[PDB]
């Protein structure tokens, strides 16, 4: 996370970290707990090739990575069938946890937006994660969860921004309609925040607008971060997560 503070302890309860086996259960991707038994995350963190579930674990909202690793096991992975690379689209995935988690004073699910939402620019939205702070600067060893408030930019304005300084003809849509743009040269996700949630405080209620997908580096001029527009995939998610 470029910019922003450490997050207040109470404030972001649904944040999930994905851990990979190695010399230790290294954090590598973010996610959000959307249902007591389901975690939402970016597909490119776990696909497109199949990963052995043995190598994967989920961790809930600790304040600091690794200080309290009650690692949950993952029972199944689901990737949107049409994913292949984030720049194409469909960078979205679901993890089914083996054990359902008690909703609790420090653990509560985020709410998915209703399909008619558009998130026009100017709404108050935040992104949260443990990824790098600049461009090679690993998050310092206290590993606090950082947060930042981003602006939202409208797609076609965003598409023009990406065309600046590039050879691609402006006929070629870069930012597809299932994507969303946010961030600023002062304020962005970065590496390792991938799969983190993007949330907006409509009517005081936190809605997850999107998922950290991809971008041409962090905080670079005229390069907003690209987010998967969750509202584009509701019909697909509710094929697996009943409510």
């Amino acid at each position, epitope marked *: 996370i470029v910019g922003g503070q450490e997050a207040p302890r109470s404030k972001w309860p649904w944040q999930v970290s994905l851990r990979v*086996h190695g010399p230790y*259960w290294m954090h590598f991707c973010g996610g959000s707990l959307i249902h007591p038994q389901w975690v939402l995350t970016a597909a490119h963190c776990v696909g497109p090739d199949v990963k052995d*579930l*043995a190598a994967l*674990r989920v961790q809930l909202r600790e304040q600091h990575l690794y200080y309290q*690793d*009650q*690692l*949950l*096991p993952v*029972s*199944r992975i689901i990737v949107h069938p049409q994913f292949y690379t984030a720049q194409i689209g469909a960078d979205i995935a679901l993890l089914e946890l*083996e*054990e359902p988690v008690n909703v609790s004073s420090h653990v509560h699910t985020v709410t998915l937006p209703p399909a008619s939402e558009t998130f026009p620019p100017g709404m108050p939205c935040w992104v949260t994660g443990w990824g790098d702070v600049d461009n090679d600067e690993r998050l310092p060893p206290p590993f606090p969860l950082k947060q930042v408030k981003v602006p939202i930019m409208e797609n076609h304005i965003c598409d023009a921004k990406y065309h600046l300084g590039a050879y691609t003809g402006d006929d070629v849509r870069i930012v597809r309609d299932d994507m969303l743009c946010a961030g600023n040269t002062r304020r962005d996700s970065c590496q390792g925040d991938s799969g983190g949630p993007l949330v907006c405080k409509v009517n005081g209620t936190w809605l997850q607008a999107g998922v950290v997908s991809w971008g041409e580096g962090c905080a670079q001029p005229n390069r907003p971060g690209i987010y998967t527009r969750v509202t584009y995939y509701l019909d697909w998610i509710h094929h697996y997560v009943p409510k």
Partner: antibody
Amino acid sequence: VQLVESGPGLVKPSETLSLTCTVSRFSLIGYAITWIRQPPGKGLEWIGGISSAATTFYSSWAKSRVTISVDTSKNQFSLKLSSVTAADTAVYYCARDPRGYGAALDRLDLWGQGTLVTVSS
Amino acid sequence: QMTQSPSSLSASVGDRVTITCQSIKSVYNNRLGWYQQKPGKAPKLLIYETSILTSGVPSRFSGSGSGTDFTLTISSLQPEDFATYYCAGGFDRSGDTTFGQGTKVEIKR
């Protein structure tokens, strides 16, 4: 990297057996452990297990008598069975699930050597 | 509950054998595996998740199954392969998971 069981091996009726399982060479963090039983000559049998999340699970019959526990401060897992009887005399094994499911048996990849437990007057 | 069949068999070196494992209801997401137990030793895992061969196992072994019925097959028995074999599977998460009775294999010579 391998498990070792430890315990008395002899106990008397109505006592409680304690068994311990110790991860010889690496941190247990992330791994589930299950306890498996083998009465002499009979086939194997599952007692229970504890997930990587420290969620315990127990067989149908075990619930009234068994407790499973863990101590990261010792890198140990511990089993206790109360009110043992002669019919509980068996080899016992602790084994690891690399997926960390607390209650699955399809992938017990790594086993301790197991020990006889004899229930005798 | 599970039934494994046959309870025992004997076959020569070179011979090709198959073992069956059945259930009153389906396994979960392919969660079934096969263990080989040498006498006086801890069991060894051979196959997991229905069909994935464990590393360090000769491709003599194979297995497959339609969620409700399953087979383990040894292409060509060796003097090494004397053991009991068990299928094991999970019908649930947290719920019913169990071994079968096992099959005792003897070398005909």
